[PDB]
Write an enzyme that holds these catalytic residues in place. Structure first.
Site, PDB file in Angstrom:
ATOM      1  N   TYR A 161      44.575   6.783  -7.773  1.00  0.00           N
ATOM      2  CA  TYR A 161      45.300   6.716  -6.522  1.00  0.00           C
ATOM      3  C   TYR A 161      44.557   7.379  -5.376  1.00  0.00           C
ATOM      4  O   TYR A 161      43.670   8.203  -5.557  1.00  0.00           O
ATOM      5  CB  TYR A 161      46.697   7.343  -6.610  1.00  0.00           C
ATOM      6  CG  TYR A 161      46.699   8.863  -6.677  1.00  0.00           C
ATOM      7  CD1 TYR A 161      46.496   9.512  -7.883  1.00  0.00           C
ATOM      8  CD2 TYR A 161      46.910   9.662  -5.531  1.00  0.00           C
ATOM      9  CE1 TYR A 161      46.501  10.894  -7.961  1.00  0.00           C
ATOM     10  CE2 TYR A 161      46.914  11.050  -5.612  1.00  0.00           C
ATOM     11  CZ  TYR A 161      46.710  11.656  -6.841  1.00  0.00           C
ATOM     12  OH  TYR A 161      46.691  13.030  -6.993  1.00  0.00           O
TER      13      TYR A 161
ATOM     14  N   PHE B 222      44.738  12.466   2.185  1.00  0.00           N
ATOM     15  CA  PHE B 222      45.061  13.845   1.865  1.00  0.00           C
ATOM     16  C   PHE B 222      44.944  14.194   0.388  1.00  0.00           C
ATOM     17  O   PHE B 222      44.898  15.387   0.065  1.00  0.00           O
ATOM     18  CB  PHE B 222      46.470  14.214   2.361  1.00  0.00           C
ATOM     19  CG  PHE B 222      47.585  13.517   1.632  1.00  0.00           C
ATOM     20  CD1 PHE B 222      48.117  14.067   0.483  1.00  0.00           C
ATOM     21  CD2 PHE B 222      48.123  12.340   2.109  1.00  0.00           C
ATOM     22  CE1 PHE B 222      49.126  13.436  -0.189  1.00  0.00           C
ATOM     23  CE2 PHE B 222      49.143  11.712   1.434  1.00  0.00           C
ATOM     24  CZ  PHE B 222      49.645  12.257   0.286  1.00  0.00           C
ATOM     25  N   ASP B 223      44.824  13.209  -0.500  1.00  0.00           N
ATOM     26  CA  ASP B 223      44.650  13.455  -1.912  1.00  0.00           C
ATOM     27  C   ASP B 223      44.173  12.162  -2.554  1.00  0.00           C
ATOM     28  O   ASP B 223      44.435  11.060  -2.049  1.00  0.00           O
ATOM     29  CB  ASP B 223      45.950  13.920  -2.569  1.00  0.00           C
ATOM     30  CG  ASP B 223      45.745  14.456  -3.982  1.00  0.00           C
ATOM     31  OD1 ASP B 223      44.616  14.901  -4.324  1.00  0.00           O
ATOM     32  OD2 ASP B 223      46.742  14.415  -4.749  1.00  0.00           O
TER      33      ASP B 223
ATOM     34  N   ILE C 163      57.349  12.036  -7.193  1.00  0.00           N
ATOM     35  CA  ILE C 163      58.294  11.705  -6.124  1.00  0.00           C
ATOM     36  C   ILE C 163      58.968  10.357  -6.402  1.00  0.00           C
ATOM     37  O   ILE C 163      58.410   9.473  -7.079  1.00  0.00           O
ATOM     38  CB  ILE C 163      57.626  11.743  -4.737  1.00  0.00           C
ATOM     39  CG1 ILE C 163      56.358  10.860  -4.687  1.00  0.00           C
ATOM     40  CG2 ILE C 163      57.280  13.180  -4.349  1.00  0.00           C
ATOM     41  CD1 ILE C 163      55.794  10.662  -3.277  1.00  0.00           C
TER      42      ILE C 163
ATOM     43  N   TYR D   8      58.776  13.734   0.081  1.00  0.00           N
ATOM     44  CA  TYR D   8      59.053  15.168   0.157  1.00  0.00           C
ATOM     45  C   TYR D   8      60.167  15.521   1.146  1.00  0.00           C
ATOM     46  O   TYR D   8      60.428  16.714   1.395  1.00  0.00           O
ATOM     47  CB  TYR D   8      57.764  15.948   0.421  1.00  0.00           C
ATOM     48  CG  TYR D   8      56.848  15.884  -0.773  1.00  0.00           C
ATOM     49  CD1 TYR D   8      56.999  16.752  -1.835  1.00  0.00           C
ATOM     50  CD2 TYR D   8      55.907  14.873  -0.895  1.00  0.00           C
ATOM     51  CE1 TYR D   8      56.178  16.662  -2.967  1.00  0.00           C
ATOM     52  CE2 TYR D   8      55.113  14.757  -2.013  1.00  0.00           C
ATOM     53  CZ  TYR D   8      55.248  15.643  -3.052  1.00  0.00           C
ATOM     54  OH  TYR D   8      54.472  15.511  -4.162  1.00  0.00           O
TER      55      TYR D   8
ATOM     56  N   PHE E  81      50.261   5.111  -0.229  1.00  0.00           N
ATOM     57  CA  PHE E  81      49.439   5.284  -1.415  1.00  0.00           C
ATOM     58  C   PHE E  81      48.794   3.962  -1.804  1.00  0.00           C
ATOM     59  O   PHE E  81      49.397   2.893  -1.685  1.00  0.00           O
ATOM     60  CB  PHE E  81      50.220   5.814  -2.620  1.00  0.00           C
ATOM     61  CG  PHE E  81      50.627   7.259  -2.515  1.00  0.00           C
ATOM     62  CD1 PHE E  81      51.856   7.608  -1.965  1.00  0.00           C
ATOM     63  CD2 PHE E  81      49.797   8.264  -2.998  1.00  0.00           C
ATOM     64  CE1 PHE E  81      52.245   8.952  -1.877  1.00  0.00           C
ATOM     65  CE2 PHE E  81      50.173   9.603  -2.931  1.00  0.00           C
ATOM     66  CZ  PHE E  81      51.397   9.944  -2.378  1.00  0.00           C
TER      67      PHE E  81
HETATM   68  C1  LIG Z   1      53.750  15.868  -9.380  1.00  0.00           C
HETATM   69  C2  LIG Z   1      54.157  15.909  -7.915  1.00  0.00           C
HETATM   70  C3  LIG Z   1      54.280  17.327  -7.397  1.00  0.00           C
HETATM   71  C4  LIG Z   1      54.525  17.566  -6.070  1.00  0.00           C
HETATM   72  C5  LIG Z   1      54.639  18.862  -5.610  1.00  0.00           C
HETATM   73  C6  LIG Z   1      54.491  19.894  -6.496  1.00  0.00           C
HETATM   74  C7  LIG Z   1      54.241  19.590  -7.810  1.00  0.00           C
HETATM   75  N1  LIG Z   1      54.142  18.332  -8.278  1.00  0.00           N
HETATM   76  N2  LIG Z   1      53.240  15.107  -7.062  1.00  0.00           N
HETATM   77  C8  LIG Z   1      51.916  15.696  -6.793  1.00  0.00           C
HETATM   78  C9  LIG Z   1      50.772  14.792  -7.264  1.00  0.00           C
HETATM   79  C10 LIG Z   1      49.495  15.583  -7.499  1.00  0.00           C
HETATM   80  O1  LIG Z   1      49.667  16.395  -8.654  1.00  0.00           O
HETATM   81  C11 LIG Z   1      50.490  13.655  -6.269  1.00  0.00           C
HETATM   82  C12 LIG Z   1      50.293  12.293  -6.925  1.00  0.00           C
HETATM   83  C13 LIG Z   1      51.606  11.740  -7.449  1.00  0.00           C
HETATM   84  C14 LIG Z   1      52.638  11.679  -6.323  1.00  0.00           C
HETATM   85  C15 LIG Z   1      52.867  13.047  -5.670  1.00  0.00           C
HETATM   86  C16 LIG Z   1      53.698  13.900  -6.623  1.00  0.00           C
HETATM   87  O2  LIG Z   1      54.804  13.472  -6.952  1.00  0.00           O
HETATM   88  N3  LIG Z   1      51.536  13.474  -5.241  1.00  0.00           N
HETATM   89  S1  LIG Z   1      51.075  13.531  -3.699  1.00  0.00           S
HETATM   90  O3  LIG Z   1      49.854  12.802  -3.599  1.00  0.00           O
HETATM   91  O4  LIG Z   1      52.202  13.148  -2.914  1.00  0.00           O
HETATM   92  C17 LIG Z   1      50.660  15.200  -3.300  1.00  0.00           C
HETATM   93  C18 LIG Z   1      51.659  16.110  -3.004  1.00  0.00           C
HETATM   94  C19 LIG Z   1      51.321  17.413  -2.688  1.00  0.00           C
HETATM   95 CL1  LIG Z   1      52.589  18.553  -2.331  1.00  0.00          CL
HETATM   96  C20 LIG Z   1      50.008  17.833  -2.631  1.00  0.00           C
HETATM   97  C21 LIG Z   1      49.036  16.900  -2.919  1.00  0.00           C
HETATM   98 CL2  LIG Z   1      47.370  17.390  -2.845  1.00  0.00          CL
HETATM   99  C22 LIG Z   1      49.333  15.587  -3.241  1.00  0.00           C
END
Ligand SMILES: C[C@@H](c1ccccn1)N1C[C@H](CO)[C@H]2CCC[C@@H](C1=O)N2S(=O)(=O)c1cc(Cl)cc(Cl)c1
Length: 163
Positions: free
Chosen positions: A61, A71-72, A89, A115, A132
């Protein structure tokens, strides 16, 4: 004052995020589900099952904010990024359960399926929609969720329901 400025900025974020989501939903090939999740298909995979709520999925992703800034991403993480639908999410929870192995989709997730008013991780502000690019590489042990036929029923209904 700072408290009135916070309210103004959140009203701003809410308004421009709504605009973003309406623009993405209006794209000729975008599909909008009842929850407000919007997607465009990039590639169709050969898999025959979608993951169940608790199936472990390897996903490749890239995440972008509404201005387009990345951002990721899996690339930045180095190791394979694996998730169960019930860990992520709501927009991802819903999308993953409608994807099969090899599917690649572009998701446009409204803030209430991401979020929310809280934001996250210090880089996602309150009231943000998220974009995404998601490719479902594999589901551990094959996938125990919806059949491809059931997925197709749901996605055809959503295409047909386009306003
Ligand atoms: C598991 C879950 C989550 C959120 C907050 C705390 C713990 N866990 N989580 C994170 C994962 C990365 O593990 C990522 C990919 C999957 C969707 C979403 C997601 O559901 N995001 S993300 O891309 O929206 C995202 C959000 C943040 Cl706060 C920071 C970054 Cl760098 C990237």
């Amino acid at each position: 004052d700072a408290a009135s400025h916070e309210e103004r900025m959140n009203n701003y974020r809410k308004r421009v995020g709504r605009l973003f989501m309406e623009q993405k939903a209006a794209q000729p090939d975008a599909v909008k589900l009842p929850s407000g999740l919007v997607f465009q298909r990039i590639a169709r995979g050969s898999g025959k099952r979608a993951p169940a709520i608790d199936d472990k999925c390897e996903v490749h992703y890239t995440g972008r904010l509404r201005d387009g800034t990345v951002f990721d991403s899996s690339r930045e993480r180095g190791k394979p990024t694996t998730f169960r639908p019930n860990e992520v999410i709501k927009g991802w929870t819903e999308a993953l359960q409608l994807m099969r192995e090899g599917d690649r989709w572009r998701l446009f997730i409204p803030y209430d399926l991401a979020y929310g008013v809280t934001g996250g991780g210090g880089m996602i502000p309150p009231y943000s929609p998220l974009e995404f690019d998601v490719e479902l590489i594999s589901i551990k042990d094959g996938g125990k969720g919806r059949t491809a036929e059931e997925v197709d029923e749901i996605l055809r209904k959503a295409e047909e329901d386009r306003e």
